[PDB]
A paper describes a structure:
Las1 and Grc3 are highly conserved proteins and have recently been identified as core enzymes involved in processing and removing ITS2 spacer, which is a key step in the synthesis of 60S ribosomal subunit.
To elucidate how Las1 and Grc3 cooperate to direct ITS2 cleavage and phosphorylation, we determined the cryo-EM and crystal structures of full-length ScLas1-Grc3 complex at 3.07 Å and 3.69 Å resolution, respectively. To be noted, the crystal structures were solved by molecular replacement method with the cryo-EM maps of Las1-Grc3 complexes. Each Grc3 GCT binds to a groove in each Las1 HEPN domain and extends to the ribonuclease active center, which is formed by the two HEPN domains via dimerization. Our crystal and cryo-EM structures exhibit that the Las1 LCT is located in a groove in the CTD domain of Grc3.
Residue numbers in the entry:
A (entry chain C), C (entry chain D): 2 to 167
B (entry chain A): 65 to 139, 165 to 618
D (entry chain B): 65 to 139, 165 to 301, 303 to 618
Write the structure that this text describes.
């Protein structure tokens, strides 16, 4: 087994990210997802080619989820479209980095059965063209639902699943 | 068709060649030849036998040109160049092990020879010179002497089209004309604005650098040649300009002006990044009016050329200078090489070799390719004032990089060292004792060398760092009062340097390797590519 | 010449929209570029089937451009991951709406040919993948210069031209 | 087959039909039957008729169930509809002119007749009940009477599956059974949860409805008046995808109304298809909530691969404490056999329902003159307020310029609401438009749709169109009641927004807003 370069200084750092992204039974004052996002921001700084896609997507979806939480005076110019703009790339980049890489080739297994193989439910295949090709952006509620479903999916399949096959 | 004159020649493995033989000479490696009698032809260029030494770099990455014989009249010849450690890079980087010698050569390989003979047996091919490129090239010969004025050539062509080869051909063509013309003091000034496949410049960097007429070097030395002296350089920090376009253009604008600062008159060269399909149609338009290209060239032809038609015409101007008051356009085929452009040597595979060879370049022509971890990195005290480092620069993003996670971000990353010139005032924000440029800007700084951060001690406020030994002691020539800036940009540290093979370096088993892990990657953590 | 439903009451309500979108004023009272987006946001209320995509995208790109211009200890200067996502959305939807409707123009014709027909720069075609099929999002300034280019192209080829063929 | 005799007059142009042996009767349109003798078989059911009137709706949108003759014993009939202005619906909206009658039939058209015979010449689809499709349904009816408990049915299938026909058949034969059974008070309740294809509900709405004699069948495009709406909510869109949890919240509120009334007996509901998409997640909560005694799936060669995990994961054993049962069956059915559209797209048919709603004087009367001719009954919105106290917008349009609001509302279909339970008004004022702030307001009553004509800020009033059928439900309502306007994405019909010549001459001086006549500039194409 050849060593791979990983941004984190230790596996304990990855456990700490796991705890940070998904708070245990408390999210009021101990939310601590802004700082986990700031950590993955450094992971991007060291090298983006080093960072696994699942960690990148967990950070990016959480970026958008923390983005939509702004309810303080004075009233901001934002008309709630930037949040809807942000979720669409968060989720599309998420679903694309699971299907496309390692490795897209001239012979490619169809996307739906790729999702079935990796365990991704087949409704995630659709949100690639759900946002980019549809005329109007999806409702903020539907995007919120998709993001909170995707984060749970990553927790179930990568963060808290110890399959080492790849 | 039979090998001849396999002379041992004790040390340096010197050898002689039969000249009048009807078989063209083909040779590969880093060598140097001194021809005794008879004319030689390297890329339809004639070199007399007036007992002058010529260094030759023949990597397998590019198609290797043959050496022809011509009258008159013939029949130390070829011998090892003074590069001791360059050929052993394969011991450190496994991929580049075959850069100078073929894999199976159908020839008795000798470890003591930097040059190797290849005769139609190996997979490689010799490009020679295409007839299609010949005519515009020999016409552009005629526009140097008869011009009687400064002739600046700007050449555009996409990756794998072969702008580098044409520009080389042009460069030796001008250098030969300089040597045999008296008094010709218009030494070439190359202008590498391409960080993707840079020639004559630092990794992921941009450079305006003078080209020395002597000693003779042909043709492509992977930036390891000694025939160029750097006048000015800037750290783009990316494999592609598209990451920082406005910065890149600014980095370009500062180079061109330098040429007027020297009041330089004579031939100058330039290669932009290809960008055949994409943003490029706009980027060239910024400096086509700025560079004043007297001889603009196009290369793509059946790329197709559908993209570089409307923008080049809008960019072209009738007269951008009082003296020139003209512009030229020409199109030539792009098929180079005939075989696959990679030839088992991808651009990303060769950029890594260039970065690796930089950090192991001891002197002008001596390389020590032992892993960096054996070498002792040197230290600078970044502080509050400070005297060691005044600020660390990051791209526009990553600005909320919080103070307690900066340190582990820096270690193991290739950086660009900068000196801060005459300062009206300092601009620094301290985060966990790390000085960081909050507003960026600071265009007055000048780039010195690349560096690889090894470790950071927050207590002693020191910064262990590797710099190429070639630059040392250029860092010491700088005044002590001069401020230092550490710029981080997306430059890829070589993998072998970051963690060497266990056979190369033996560590204590209890010592933990921080930024690397040995466990099998969990399903499914894969890097998006 | 069958009648068409359009959200604006008359030409005098769309003529001022063009002036608002391209004021040539940096700031203060003369700049009314937020108001143009707040008005196209009301156009989406009655629509969005009447609202042309050339106006929907002019508003989205401008909303993102206004989004990254926050300079008072808030918004973007703290974190610049939302802006890249918003520019990617605005530019991708702008490109898609013109290049790939597959209704107004003949189907199966390659995208570069349609970009030639409608006059779109050829590099806008590659703006589709841009942030969707690559590991890392494009640089922040690379996005700004492309968004400004798209707005200039829209102003030159739609808000000015007197062609009524379609 | 030789056509029967024709009896003209005195009214309704009643026709008498006689078929030798057993023949499939093809009749299209709305018509009433009073079968004196013999047995009627409409889709393998028995309808013995003795001086009872049976109203039939046979649009060309779906395949018309042919009327079969059966013993015993035979060998006014097909009397005209009581509806007056439904057929002239072709006049206003000319894409629906052939819904009741074919285009060029092999029979002379008549304005008096609202029914038309189809002697196989029009080549239209009249495919009858499949045998294979009958067996799974027949099993539910053997479980309808011996269940001894309330029976709740769900049916699952996307568009083109044939879900609506299956529920229709269940409805007719259930209502036949309850009439047969004496005395049965198990009045079945239809719980329309499908804003995509309304059945028994207002456009873009969700409705729990009581299903009650006279006989009506089978597909009446929500115009049947065979049902009484117990409760309704305004989803405001043709797809729950736009507001998933809002639609789920409305469905939860509607289903809970069933236990609120403590109803026991047959009850049905159709969920939106959602065979492929977020439907896997959307159905896992409503199956959990409604406690369905019979699940039914129709995907077959759709294919069925997408909608598979729901039956195992979402079943959760039996939700009901008393039912303690579940059913999981699959059937193969692609109805209709021909193209699903049948020259009637779902979006094309959806416009007809809105148009007919806005033009109905009452259940049995229709007047399809443009509402621009009709007076727009006005309401005063104030700061008090009396009448309209709040205006609601979808969440993403919550930061909107006060100046543009006046232009946004006019010519848009809206939902009128009553505050119901007494609470704080909680409304924000923008240019005298009381925009409802923070949304919420869970407790509301949805009354009807409305089409806003104009707004007078100085008088603080709104000239607004509501269907004449509801009047005077709006008037028969307490004066102090607070009234809310919810403008969600409901599409106003084009032929109704601006009329054309030969309908209204208009005036030369008058300039029509929101409509332009100049040819569209290049690149003004709407994204689709």
């Amino acid at each position: 087994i050849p060593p791979r370069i990983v941004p984190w200084r230790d596996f304990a750092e990855l456990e700490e990210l796991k705890l940070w992204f998904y708070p245990k039974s408390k999210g009021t004052i101990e939310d601590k997802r802004q700082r986990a996002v700031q950590r993955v921001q450094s992971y991007r700084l060291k090298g983006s080619q080093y960072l696994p896609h699942v960690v990148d997507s967990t950070a990016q979806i959480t970026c958008a989820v923390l983005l939509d939480e702004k309810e303080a005076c004075l009233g901001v110019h934002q008309d709630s479209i930037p949040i809807r703009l942000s979720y669409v790339m968060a989720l599309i980049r998420f679903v694309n980095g699971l299907l496309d890489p390692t490795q897209q080739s001239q012979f490619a297994i169809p996307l739906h059965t790729l999702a079935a193989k990796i365990g991704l439910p087949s409704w995630f295949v659709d949100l690639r063209h759900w946002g980019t090709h549809e005329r109007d952006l999806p409702g903020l509620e539907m995007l919120r639902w998709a993001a909170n479903e995707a984060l749970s999916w990553l927790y179930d399949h990568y963060w808290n699943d110890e399959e080492l096959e790849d | 068709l039979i090998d001849n004159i396999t002379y041992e020649g004790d040390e340096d493995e010197t050898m002689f060649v039969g000249l009048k033989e009807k078989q063209k000479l083909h040779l590969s490696g880093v060598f140097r030849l001194q021809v005794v009698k008879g004319g030689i032809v390297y890329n339809n260029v004639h070199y007399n036998a007036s007992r002058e030494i010529l260094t030759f770099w023949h990597p397998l990455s590019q198609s290797i040109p043959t050496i022809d014989f011509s009258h008159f009249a013939g029949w130390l010849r070829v011998f090892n160049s003074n590069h001791t450690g360059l050929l052993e890079a394969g011991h450190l980087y496994r991929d580049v092990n075959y850069l100078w010698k073929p894999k199976e050569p159908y020839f008795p390989l000798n470890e003591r020879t930097t040059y190797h003979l290849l005769h139609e047996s190996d997979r490689i091919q010799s490009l020679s010179v295409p007839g299609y490129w010949s005519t515009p090239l020999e016409k552009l010969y005629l526009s140097h002497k008869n011009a009687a004025y400064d002739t600046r050539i700007m050449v555009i062509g996409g990756k794998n089209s072969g702008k580098s080869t044409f520009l080389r051909l042009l460069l030796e063509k001008f250098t030969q004309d300089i040597r045999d013309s008296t008094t010709s003091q218009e030494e070439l000034v190359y202008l590498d604005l391409d960080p993707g496949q840079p020639e004559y410049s630092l990794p992921d960097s941009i450079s305006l650098n003078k080209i020395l007429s002597s000693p003779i070097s042909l043709g492509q030395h992977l930036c390891q040649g000694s025939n160029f002296q750097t006048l000015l350089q800037f750290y783009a920090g990316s494999s592609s300009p598209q990451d920082e376009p406005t910065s890149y253009l600014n980095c370009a604008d500062k180079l061109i002006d330098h040429l007027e600062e020297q009041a330089f008159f004579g031939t100058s060269l330039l290669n932009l990044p290809g960008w055949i399909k994409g943003f490029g149609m706009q980027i060239l338009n910024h400096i086509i009016r700025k560079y004043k290209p007297t001889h603009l060239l196009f290369l793509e032809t059946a790329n197709s050329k559908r993209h570089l038609d409307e923008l080049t015409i809008p960019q072209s101007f009738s007269t951008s200078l009082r003296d020139a008051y003209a512009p030229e356009v020409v199109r030539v085929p792009a098929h180079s090489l005939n075989h696959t452009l990679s030839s088992r040597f991808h651009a990303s595979q060769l950029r890594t070799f260039k970065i690796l060879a930089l950090f192991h370049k001891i002197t002008q022509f001596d390389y020590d390719f032992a892993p960096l971890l054996k070498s002792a990195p040197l230290q600078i005290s970044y502080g509050k004032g400070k005297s060691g480092i005044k600020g660390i620069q990051f791209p526009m993003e990553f600005q909320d990089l919080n103070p307690q996670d900066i340190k582990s971000a820096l270690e193991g990353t290739v950086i660009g060292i900068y000196t801060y010139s005459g300062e009206d005032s300092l601009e620094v924000k301290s985060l966990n004792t790390f000085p960081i440029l909050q507003s960026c800007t600071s265009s007055s700084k000048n780039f010195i060398t690349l560096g690889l951060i090894h470790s950071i001690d927050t207590s002693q406020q020191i910064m262990n760092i590797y710099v190429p030994p070639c630059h040392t002691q250029i860092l010491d020539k700088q005044p002590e009062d001069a401020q230092w800036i550490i710029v981080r940009n997306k430059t890829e540290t070589p993998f072998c340097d970051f963690l060497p093979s266990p056979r190369t370096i033996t560590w204590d088993d209890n010592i933990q390797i921080p930024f690397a892990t040995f466990e099998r990657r969990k399903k499914l953590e894969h890097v998006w590519k």
